[PDB]
Ligand binder design. Sequence first.
Ligand SMILES: CCCCCCCC/C=C/CCCCCCCC(=O)O[C@H](COC(=O)CCCCCCCCCCCCCCC)COP(=O)(O)OC[C@@H](O)CO
Lengths: 311, 311, 311, 311, 311
Amino acid sequence: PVDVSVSIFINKIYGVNTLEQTYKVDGYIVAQWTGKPRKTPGDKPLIVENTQIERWINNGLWVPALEFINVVGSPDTGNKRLMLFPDGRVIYNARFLGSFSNDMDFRLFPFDRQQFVLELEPFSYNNQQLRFSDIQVYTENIDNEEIDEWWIRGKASTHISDIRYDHLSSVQPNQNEFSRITVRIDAVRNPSYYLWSFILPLGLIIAASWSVFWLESFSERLQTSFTLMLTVVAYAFYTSNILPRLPYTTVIDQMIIAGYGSIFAAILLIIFAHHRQANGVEDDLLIQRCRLAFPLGFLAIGCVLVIRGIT
Amino acid sequence: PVDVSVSIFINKIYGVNTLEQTYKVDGYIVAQWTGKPRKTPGDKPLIVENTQIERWINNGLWVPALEFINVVGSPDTGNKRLMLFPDGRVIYNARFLGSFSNDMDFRLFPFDRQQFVLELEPFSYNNQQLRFSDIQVYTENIDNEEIDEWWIRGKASTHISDIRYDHLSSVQPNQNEFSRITVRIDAVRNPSYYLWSFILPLGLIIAASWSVFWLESFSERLQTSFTLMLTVVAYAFYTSNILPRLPYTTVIDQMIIAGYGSIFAAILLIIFAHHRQANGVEDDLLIQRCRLAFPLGFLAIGCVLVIRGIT
Amino acid sequence: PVDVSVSIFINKIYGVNTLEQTYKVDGYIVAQWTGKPRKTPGDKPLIVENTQIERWINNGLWVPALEFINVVGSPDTGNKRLMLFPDGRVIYNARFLGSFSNDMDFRLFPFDRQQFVLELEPFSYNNQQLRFSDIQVYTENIDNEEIDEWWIRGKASTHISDIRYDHLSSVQPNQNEFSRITVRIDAVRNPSYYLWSFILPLGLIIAASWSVFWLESFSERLQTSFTLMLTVVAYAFYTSNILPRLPYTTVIDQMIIAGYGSIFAAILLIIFAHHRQANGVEDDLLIQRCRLAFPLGFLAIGCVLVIRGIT
Amino acid sequence: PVDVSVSIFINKIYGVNTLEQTYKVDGYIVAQWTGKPRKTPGDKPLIVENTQIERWINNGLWVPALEFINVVGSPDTGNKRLMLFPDGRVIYNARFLGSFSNDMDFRLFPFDRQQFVLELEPFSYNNQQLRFSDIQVYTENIDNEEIDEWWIRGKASTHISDIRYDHLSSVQPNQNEFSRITVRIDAVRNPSYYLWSFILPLGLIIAASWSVFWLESFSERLQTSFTLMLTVVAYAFYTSNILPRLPYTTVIDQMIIAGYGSIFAAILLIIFAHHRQANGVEDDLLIQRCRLAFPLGFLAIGCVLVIRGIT
Amino acid sequence: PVDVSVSIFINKIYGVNTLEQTYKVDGYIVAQWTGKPRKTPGDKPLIVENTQIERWINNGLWVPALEFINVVGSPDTGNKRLMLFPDGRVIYNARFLGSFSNDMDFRLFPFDRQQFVLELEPFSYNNQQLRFSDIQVYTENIDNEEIDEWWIRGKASTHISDIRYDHLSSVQPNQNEFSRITVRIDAVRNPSYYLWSFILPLGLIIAASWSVFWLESFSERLQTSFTLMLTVVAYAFYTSNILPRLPYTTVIDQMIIAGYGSIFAAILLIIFAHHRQANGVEDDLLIQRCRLAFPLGFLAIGCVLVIRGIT
Ligand SMILES: CCCCCCCC/C=C/CCCCCCCC(=O)O[C@H](COC(=O)CCCCCCCCCCCCCCC)COP(=O)(O)OC[C@@H](O)CO
């Protein structure tokens, strides 16, 4: 088995696509193994750049192809380089930008924690085995972290494992296990834009909706409920036009649904308080009792949604 | 006829485009046939990766080109690999990401069932025949299925058939039939975001529109009908800005049309109840009889649309 | 002159871009001519696929380049293939996906008829002449036609003509005429989504705007006219956010302009009926006479626009 | 110096991007010079198409590279062709589609005049000099001009000049001057969609805003001013969602700003006319004097903006 | 060490993407070093263009690969050129268009200052050292500067430094330091569109919101507060649909939040002034005292945000 040591440098993680559950990573790959001794000009390391690599492969140089098994498409490889030492060592160094996919769950959207993952695996070998994985995310974004969309916690997690492919050759004593390198980078979204421009104003609109119980006429309470209903629709548009698309409801959308429910429940109470001929449009304490019971009932419902997400 | 056995691995189905009726599939192709015996270094399997394949074809190696006849454009092939055994077997292994087209019908949009299809066919041979097709959708997304946009039901359907091209050579005793592999994957859309953020609030807006018959003045009933009309337009915008574009009306759009109709029919009844000098603005039971007849009439219409889609 | 027979297969017409007046076509090209007799292995047809074609051209095989003179850019050619018969025949078979441009006129937008056009012409020869053109649009989309955006009427129109380039060599006895193949496919847009979700509700909003003449106060008529004006603006946004961009006004936009005009003309009549001290805010039959004259006047204007488009 | 004669054919100008100040041009380049006499098969012109050109360059054929110095990126060259005559002439013919940049000024947006520019220059030669430039915009779009986004006035302007690069070799007696071909095509935007769907309705909304001075109550005048303020915001959204993005204000945006100013100035006058206890809510001719002074003052302001743009 | 002198020409800086913190730069690279003397045809400079460069590298010409270490992906290189002098000098000249990333901070969005950065570094050498860097931004955009999105202040800053990579070979006496060229171009955004179409009208809407304290009824003050609340939501949509996406709040968004707060604080005061039975709906000077205290309190808050950004 040819031992291969790998170092991954991460320069930039960006472009998270929520519907496809993909993200872009730009960085370097440094693979190093040990072949047989060779003679190089000047008995010093020999450097072979981008298009000269292909001429060495045709002459019989063994350069294993390393594939990302989560990449969507083909990574946009930039500059490549080989460094053939006279004692046998070979260092392969490449620049990559690709779109990677992972199971990402945005159900706590403004406060979600993701885990960007890179999986590396030799494309056509089972007994060329990876030993060391060093991940150097040298971008110490701890400084000026508050201007970045994603905060990166911890350094990185590396893991060398053996993946078994049972859908393989009949003769598979050890001919169906492939070495795999997994890199995990934890991240936390930056909940400042979504906490000041989406959640705070939505709390004020819903809070102002309970003001409808302070008007002093049945006709006034009903008519201003439709303006409130139009305000929430105009707010669900401002939200859905900015927030990322998802196949489930986040915590912002569940507040909007509660906004529709609060206004609609107010309309039923306004109508019921007016047309029950036991309190009627005369002295009626159902409205006064509703000035207090509506904020409390909504606050309790806000707690049920706040424990559903955490659990 | 050279027998070819094919295995397709499906990694990711995503990016459904409703107007073009296309979708993206990423996975592997494994073709295997049996040529003539050859001598390989060490009498062990020989591996030929990406750019070394072209050097073997120039020397006379027979590598048939397999084409997807539903792909839109050219698939973005990544890593390729040949494995030439000494006893004659040849295994071709490639990575593909392409955009595939199929007749997709979204007329039940939030509850539609699709059928993603891959069709494979040799590009230039009629007596190189495919025998086996194994489809391994190993992505057991049954776990964490609720965070995915599409739920995949069943395993997969494979079928090897013979397609006849009558627009072909004059001498076509058997020279116009091509083997074809068809793969079908059933799917069901995830109706949670569209059932809580589009259908439920739309039911509340239309339900609140019937509240206009509880106001106690002709001037009030007419003026609040225009606010309701503005609310539905503001809702048709919030819907059309998120839902996928289609050349027909889905079930959400047919509710919006009923929303316009309900408000417009209310305006005619409000005006007619006021200007018929047989009940007039005095004691008038046409409005009271309309507090009940409007929700029932709309509920019945909702059933007609609910049976049109199923049938 | 080398006679060339051409067959075009059309698989998919989609992606109409209204501003650029381009559309995408995916299909096959089959060119067939007759060269000089050659000797092939086994005295049977010889097949030369994608990258092996270039090795035959370098050895002196004559493969004329056929260009689409309406394509915007360069078509994305997929698989290619040559079939060299021993008696001299050569069949060239390629897969193309390109963006094609034609003079498209959308002035009747929801009911417009287009004409998708493909123009083929040898890139560098004047006495290599095309004789036969067969267009096989085998996609019998007559079934499930109602789920497609474009309905295709008729089969196809083919035409072989000679284009003269006067901007050419001084010696042009016949050295400036190029054979050209023109393919025309008629189509009609699917006017169901645009007839139920854009035209019908717009007719209801404008019809409900004439209800402003049934209110019984000058203050009420004026104030509800501004809500109507806001409704039409909110509707012109919902329309312009979905309809394709164009450099002229379609029939939907001309109804919106009439919507603005009807409301604005109503405001002038409401104000004039109140401030003319010959009928004044007292008994005034100008408003009653306007309950009828407004729908009729608007209906007549709708006919003028309905004959302008047809003519 | 090798004399080079150039002909540019323009097929399509489209895709104007206002923020980047770029546009797309599709057409042909025909370069012709005179080398040394050669012997061709049959003593007739020899044609060398796309990939065979590279084999002639390797054997020492001089084919200068012509670069567009305004192109953003690299043009998407399609088919190429050489025509080597036996008497020495060489004709180079290529198909290009590229994105070109020029200083474009949209400050009169709906009535702006642009000037699409192509600049051509040999990439690495100073004494290979261009003599003739013929620009053949054969697209006589005078017919069906009204369905096109851009109207093209005049034919074309050509100019062969010498550009001096002072940032060049120390020995630059004449080794720093490069021949340059400049092509200019005048154009005028099609002001029909923007004159009927954006300017006319905006004139009606602002005109209807002056109707607020005809209501007969302080409470009514103030409340309907906020509906008008909401209408203009709803209109600035419909405008900014369709008009191209720019780093300055066009003439449409300056009308919207005047719309905000007119409504806001109306609010101050309504409040001031009510709370000055010299005319008060009693008989007050400041409002009546404002029914006339507001349209005139706004008309005069419209003239100041109409002379600022022209000057 | 081989001395390399570099000149960068900048043609166009555009396409700033605020979420990815990237921008596009188009220009030239001119590298010049001195190899060993060679014999050229005619004893004059020899020019080797695009595809002929690769044939010289295969024969042993040393052409170091220069990489941009901030580029996202791979730059779209256009025309290349070598100029081999007989005395040994070699000049490498290339055209590039790439997407570059830098730490960009938009927290003062309409008045932000950016710093576009290009970093150049040899890809595989440590003792090939860069000496001179000349940056020639010849685009004297001082003229017609007001039609450009970005104003460029100063000329350019160049810097040649040594970057140490400690993650490198065990034998690193000097084998881990790489020469680096850094180019910085200061810029200031053009605050005209965002100062007239976003900040001025937002100041008028908030100013008009304080007019609610001049109405003379509790019912009128409350109902027109909800129209104001709808206006601000309709304005936050018009803003968020045009302004660039960011992960923090700019100065425009902080005014919108103050707009929500001002209206919501007004609602509490309106309700409190009506339901405190010490001033009540009778003669109440809390509203009059609020006609003045609201503009002043908001003006002071506007100063706190105006000093937070500067500090
Ligand atoms: C299906 C609708 C489609 C289009 C929608 C149109 C938009 C809105 C609709 C309004 C009408 C709805 C039903 C109303 C039925 C009318 C009720 C009725 O029969 O009795 C009298 C008729 O009205 C009158 O005075 C006027 C006499 C004529 C009757 C009504 C006016 C013409 C209606 C124009 C229709 C458009 C046709 C064209 C469509 C393209 C009124 O009592 P009256 O006199 O004691 O007091 C009136 C006061 O002004 C003085 O006291």
